[PDB]
Point group: D2
Chain length 509, copies 4
């Protein structure tokens, strides 16, 4: 009855998964909390069970994590980098079966499941070199006989709360950077990707244990809102990296600020692609299709708003319709499929609610709009035209493959329309105009954290910092100097001279 008990899914055992799995790791495996069963969204069947963290589990894990930090922080950063290099290799060894698990439990297609693991592998190899580079400048003091140095030190315990839609890579970004920076980590993944969290944690735990290091360096406490709220309120959690909905991130941001902790927020996106009249349409059409329907439209960076200049709107919409019709639907592990199921049955219903609401606001469904007549959580990728850019349904993030299409005329208004929504994650223009490109990158251009040209709103690489502005929450992950959010800066002045301050007419001995 459980997928893991059927011979067809015996590969799950290669990740150390059993029918019932421990969802707490702190050097020891356990879990006295509520038992949840996660389901395969492609067939609505249960996969296996995870025993989540009780309050006592969480309490003991923080204490073990903070004790482990005393050991971990004393390990020189390049040697911490060597640990992270071995994690990358351990992910490389399991990339296919781990990616299959992402496809099975979360529901994205196999290439994206493996691709998500590869992103973690890449950030590991990146972090290895970074582990020899993090630090600050030695600066020229204005004072004779004084040295002035900017030091960076770990903040301590980094709590990491992640979402269902990227159940490996977001944690991996946070883990690899926090680790080389000398922090310990506590992970609370999405409950519906609990098997993924356990499996990832098993791979990391082995590297840590094989190197005679305390496992609490990369702790796991599977749970839901209760555990995440505990982390948000916990003074022992020095940095809380949160990836999830804007609604919850706001509450997490407030709870962390209330205690003068640190938060790193990666919240919703409502991402726009803008196509100008001079754009290469043979580039626009595939870029739009893949940015809209990739991962069944459940990416933070999924394209939700497509603005097309009036002169090319009908052509681009028509070319998208003909292209949508060829999107191959099926099981996410079959390599022929580009499009899998939504993550939950609730999401299917929410998809239908949004299509209906779009119709109520005057939009026309020119393609899709319906649930597919097959098992699982499959819906048609959908294109809605005729809404005004200020339509209410278009200002909501719905994790469904619905692309709202708008007309525009001039550059200034459509830049403003890109910027008018509350999120500020990703954005793209398609144009050949040199001045427009640099204006888009400038202070009167895109207000988002990811600002792309002739490439869609999706697919960012690790070399750059990843994150958004406005209600997207402002945190950054992965590249550039994002590592500084995982460390505390100190400005340090060393007086090494024999000089004595001026007496100022006080007679000292």
């Amino acid at each position: 009855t459980l997928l893991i008990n059927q011979p067809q899914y015996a590969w799950l055992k290669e990740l150390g998964l059993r029918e019932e799995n421990e969802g707490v790791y702190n050097g020891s495996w356990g879990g006295r909390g509520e038992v949840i069963t996660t389901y395969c969204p492609a067939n609505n069947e249960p996969i296996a069970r995870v025993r989540q963290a009780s309050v006592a589990d969480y309490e003991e894990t923080v204490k073990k994590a903070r004790e482990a930090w005393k050991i971990w922080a004393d390990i020189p950063a390049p040697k911490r980098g060597e640990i992270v290099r071995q994690i990358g290799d351990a992910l490389r060894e399991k990339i296919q079966v781990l990616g299959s698990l992402v496809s099975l439990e979360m529901g994205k297609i196999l290439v994206e499941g493996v691709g998500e693991v590869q992103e973690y592998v890449d950030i590991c190899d990146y972090a290895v070199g970074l582990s020899r580079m993090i630090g600050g400048p030695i600066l020229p003091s204005e004072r004779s006989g004084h040295a002035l140095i900017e030091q960076w030190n770990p903040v301590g315990l980094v709590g990491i709360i992640t979402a269902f839609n990227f159940p490996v890579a977001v944690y991996g970004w946070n883990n690899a950077i926090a680790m080389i920076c000398g922090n310990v980590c506590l992970w609370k993944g999405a409950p519906t990707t609990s098997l993924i969290s356990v499996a990832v944690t098993k791979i990391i735990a082995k590297v840590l244990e094989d190197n005679k290091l305390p496992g609490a360096i990369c702790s796991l406490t599977c749970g839901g809102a209760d555990i995440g709220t505990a982390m948000a309120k916990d003074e022992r959690v020095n940095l809380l990296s949160f990836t999830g909905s804007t609604q919850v991130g706001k509450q997490v941001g407030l709870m962390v600020q209330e205690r003068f902790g640190r938060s790193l927020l990666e919240l919703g996106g409502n991402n726009a692609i803008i196509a100008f009249e001079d754009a290469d349409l043979s580039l626009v059409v595939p870029s739009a299709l893949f940015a809209a329907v990739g991962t069944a439209g459940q990416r933070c960076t999924t394209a939700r708003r497509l603005f097309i200049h009036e002169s090319i709107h009908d052509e681009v919409v028509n070319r998208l319709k003909k292209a949508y019709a060829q999107i191959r639907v099926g099981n996410p592990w079959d390599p022929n499929v580009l499009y899998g199921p939504l993550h939950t049955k609730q999401a299917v219903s929410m998809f239908l609610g949004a299509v209906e609401e779009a119709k109520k606001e005057g939009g026309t469904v020119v393609y899709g709009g319906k649930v597919m007549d097959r098992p699982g959580n499959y819906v048609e990728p959908t294109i809605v035209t005729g809404l005004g850019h200020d339509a209410s349904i278009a200002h909501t993030q719905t994790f469904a493959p619905i692309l709202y299409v708008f007309k525009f005329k001039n550059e200034e208004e459509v830049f403003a329309w890109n910027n008018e929504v509350k999120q500020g994650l990703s954005s793209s223009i398609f144009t050949k105009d040199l001045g427009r490109i640099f204006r888009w990158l400038g202070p009167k251009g895109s207000d988002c954290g990811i600002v792309n040209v002739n490439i869609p709103t999706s697919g960012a690489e690790i070399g750059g910092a990843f994150g958004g502005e406005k209600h997207t929450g402002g945190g950054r992950e992965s590249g550039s100097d994002a590592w500084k959010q995982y460390m505390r800066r100190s400005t340090c002045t060393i007086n090494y001279s024999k000089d004595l301050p001026l007496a100022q007419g006080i007679k000292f001995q």
Copy 2:
């Protein structure tokens, strides 16, 4: 009756100050809120009056600032730097009278009032060069035919709330950096230093007007908590830099987080000096005195906790008492005075309460402890021995010259005691031991933002970032890459190739 009407203080008119001054600037001068009279803390005489901002004044100023930003953001950064260079020159022109006004209205001694203006001048000169340097890296994309650029753009309107104790330098740090970064500024200074705020704004306004720039680039709205709260809640204020008490700053941080704004918080300090057995006592004793009694103990970085190794505790305390007896107290503008009044009568009351509480918690006043019987807000610089390091009064920041002295035996405990309070601004050890110094700078060392060796807790220059950790709020001002808090990062990918994404079995047109 007003000091500015007496011929003795005619130098005040050199700052353009009159009997009643407008406390709103946005290109025009005004102020329809309550008229405030500010008093000289050395003799309680009224200096002059300021008409503060009403709600409508605030509203118009924000709109005018944001209109001005549209112009200011288009001016190339080095040219904005040129503007900041002229601000520095205009301050140099008035440095003596302006520093005299700081001594008169705030009450710190003349050399510090002048020095605070110099600090603003210096950050201006620093910002000139920085205006040709701000930016991010061009990074090697992993994709052929793609450029990968990290861009920085202004956040927009920078609200700056400052405190009484540095009524020039804190604003200046924020202003010079925010300006070269392309932001407009709105200043709400402390009500009791309103004349300083007006006099500084008159200097800047002239520079802006002479350069045919809208004055709202450096707007002023004098007011109290009501205006400060309006700024924290105002979505048009993209960054709120708040310098003040931890209690108010916590609410400021929460209100800004509530609306997904940005805050830069510079809050309380509870700064410790630690003297080890190998310390050069001829360095310890004067460093401790000046760090404790400087600015009448009213710096954020004032030394409030003195840990002395048991072997040298009595000697250092005795030598400290004998040096305290030689502190020259008087009017802060008089040439040989080292110690002036507290800023307000409420501060005198807070001083008396803290001294009372210290006795109730088991402390002994071995020097000072009393209000001085003279005109003005003068209190004796005070030394308290015998409290436990965890006494509650020692864990509170009181903006009064009270130095709590402790014994210690070993390095590990005293580092933990440095770190055990909620504040985390500045810290200092005095020792000759090389290993101890670098442990102090390391992950098990001081948890503060300023970590000093053989120099007191007020050693900081503009080249380094200024700010603290934990309840000090986490913001940084002035040097290093502190400028990044005033800008928004974007990770920009430009596909410049003619390449078309992979079909993935869809036949495009």
Copy 3:
């Protein structure tokens, strides 16, 4: 008979110039070498006289500068920056008269003479902030208990040899950076700009004297090749910055390399403008004209080669001919003048020789080509068509306003033709094509140190490093991390632990 003795030129006295001037400064003024008279290239009249450095004067000066270095290197970098800041202010105060002297003695037009002084003013303002930033990273050692620091220290004495065409700015670039980096400077300018060198040195001297610093920090030894060769061979000259011809610079590089010294070489350019078919012609023609005839074609960055796509070649040449006819020629101090004389009569002879050789190799003079019939060194700006891109006369740098125009068809060949010359300083393409622009900036694009797009070859500002590749010598001046050429890097490891290396079975004590 000397211009400085005529009442119309009495403004020369505002620079401290007299009928006979000392050309050696090392704290005191002197000069026992040959007396040189410099002449005005607009009318060949003598201006004033300068007593150049004898060899003994050179010996005395190097010794005084090196003693002064002991003082200067102990001054904190930001305080050195403060000195450089006052130098900027001192130049700002004399900008008009000094700019007029540049126009008078060197012969460039007044607006460019004034602008050249402004460049020195600007690098001063830039260096002030840089003086608080120079340094290296603190790196995380792989060894426990070890610190790893990259330090930068002055090299000592920076010899600066400059050329006639930028007799202020090149020295100023080298001076301001070397100074904040803790070096002393010894300047040997071009003999034909000796008055300018004295005037600049008099301005710097007063600042050093007013700040009680040894004047030898900015030493001057006016002389010709003999003094320059001693500097190249002098082991006491730790860094030799040389700006001049490739022929001399090659010998300078070899002499400095022979003694394992450091050289900074800024040699010839043979700079190309390339206009593609899609270029904005209303942008091309003015940019080309001004880049070719600016400073009478005597800039290191002067456009000497103009490649035009076949489809627009004839049109652009015709529009360039029609625009050249409007070039206003006259005395460089006269208002409204765009074009002055060549610097020397030898340059007149070199111009005519190049024009004749161009015809002898098959070129057609389509505009200009002749000496002007008027006093001074006036030649007509010249455009030559019909030569092959590899014509020998076109591959020589002749500091004369002769523009060689070529046809091209394809991007690859014309990129190759940009790169085929021995020099490698500046280069420019005019185009709208996004892919072409980034290829131009890429590894298969321009091989030059300055690579510009839709702006001519003289588009340089101080924020970036300035210099070229190949036979241009490879040095960089002014911006970016160019300061590192004036400093020596050290990689410093501090073991602060009590740890003792492994005995390796040796019985120690």
Copy 4:
């Protein structure tokens, strides 16, 4: 007769070595030059043969490397990093056999031979992250509508000449950095380590072939002075990295300068350890011993001058003598052996010549001084006292384990004595004094490129730049921004606005 034919050395075959080996690789293997036989310095026995490069071999290989560059430079740097990551793994798999070959052919002890391979492995893992970081800033232009970006591009062909004493790591440092920077490499190793150069090249060649890349990206032309001179004179060799004697490097540097090429010179060292009176003698003695006799005193960073304060001179020499007597001598591959043979028979004669000359100059041999009566090139590690610090024998770099010991009294003279030699590679002081340490790191301290405190002159790590000053040639390898030497900087201004230059009263159309 050949060691490779004896069964004990059958492990050599795991590196692809046979009795006679090809020493030219450019995608194909060959060698038409003279066949060289390399000998084991531990027993003077021949190991195997390598066919070196003829002139035609060199010509063909350069042409093939320059063709391969066209492909390699078009590969995005992070993908180039992926190749270098695989080189690191391929080295890891063969680390034992390769390290053993270093011991066999070069003669250092096994743990150091293995350690040299690890340094290559580590720079690879480092470069993987660095390959996502190399680049320059985008800078704020002073011109509206202009972008200012600093680009870095490969120089092209990086010629790499290495020496016998570090036959793997130096090439590896240059190779890994040059590769991620987009250059191709041509390697000419030391003739007497030809088998090592072949073995390393076979490992890289397989990685390149398995990745379907042209093998000439990492070309090899084994040879002696003739090939090296050809590389120094070859304009197709864009950068020549030369590691070797000062005598040869000076000539190489001049040849490269003659053609306006780029050189990176890593030449002789004459490195000093200075022990002050307050030094931890239990730290001084082992550190000195290992730095003098490690690698039989054949490191570039070997300690050759030991300055000891007169108060502890006699004690330190005695403890060093008693410790030298316990050095375990034997075959370098034998476990627990700390001291092996000199590299050649010529080195034995040089050692003897140096000892006699040291005695001739008044030095007293207090330990060693004689050849060991055993097979191989074994000489006793030697300590010489009684010389003046400026003794001629002490100012020569002799690649022999001779430690010259001097007395001193004061810090200033001994810092001056450190700096008085022509080399400037490594240096160490041993002291506890805080002020002295920072004076040592400062402008009046060590003039060397490596400046150490409480550790010997050896043991550089990957994170920092490695190299020296003065006659050491000035090049840097490995860490920090040393990668910039393998690339060319361009300062790029893009005008993206529709603005037209100022007419300046010319009537364009």
